[PDB]
Symmetry: C2
Subunit: 146 residues, 2 copies
């Protein structure tokens, strides 16, 4: 028959079937605007990598991997592509014998700041039709999912 | 607009993407969350063309063709010329593509249920309603 790996053929899902399509439709509205106003093929994980490097000055490949829940080999490949596009740079860590730390270049920081500005602008427009009470309910519900 | 809204929604998008990607990695499905969705759209809309896939994925012709050629290279998807319009391709899953789609669908069924399990059915309906008001 059909191989489902470690999945159960009788698994019963109870999630509201409109939840994942509603969140993906919101994601598409946000991502389309980011892609259009940036204009280089940055993917949503690329944008998150830049954010983590900017917010955690000098973090290493192991800590980035752990935060992205991706294996060290996959995240190093991603960093080498971003290095190639002059968005990220590796610097020798002084507190070690031979290890490296990640930093954004001037171009990498500029892309991160611009994308963040687009996100801020697009979210303001998208959720303006919600009343302050509905916005607080939305925050509370999104926070419960972590 | 509530200043905690954009960070909360972006943390949820990032948490959902990360969880799906980890679950696919854990069972060695060499797929990303948009690939899973591409396979689903091809399976549910038999013989859909590349233009209609592009529109549904919100991707220009160049990016969606690249994605389909990578899946074709992995023998998951088949491109067939539309007999009524030889300039256009119709997309189908191969036997291997269908098998990977069915496995990915059983993972997503469990993963989607686990991701929103912290919300009660009433809270999930409220979340849908609030997201829908923004279209």
């Amino acid at each position: 028959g059909v191989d489902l790996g470690t999945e159960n053929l009788y698994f019963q899902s109870m999630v509201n079937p409109d939840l994942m399509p509603a969140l993906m439709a919101v994601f598409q509205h946000v991502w389309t605007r980011i892609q259009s106003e940036l204009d280089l093929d940055l993917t949503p994980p690329d944008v998150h990598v830049l954010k983590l490097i900017d917010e955690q000055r000098g973090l290493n490949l192991q800590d980035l991997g752990r935060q992205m829940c991706r294996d060290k080999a996959l995240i190093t490949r991603k960093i080498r592509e971003l290095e190639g596009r002059n968005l990220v740079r590796r610097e020798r860590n002084p507190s070690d014998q031979r290890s490296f730390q990640l930093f954004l270049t001037d171009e990498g920081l500029a892309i991160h700041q611009h994308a963040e500005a687009i996100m801020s602008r697009v979210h303001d427009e998208l959720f303006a039709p919600l009343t302050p009470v509905e916005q607080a309910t939305l925050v509370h519900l999104l926070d419960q999912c972590l």
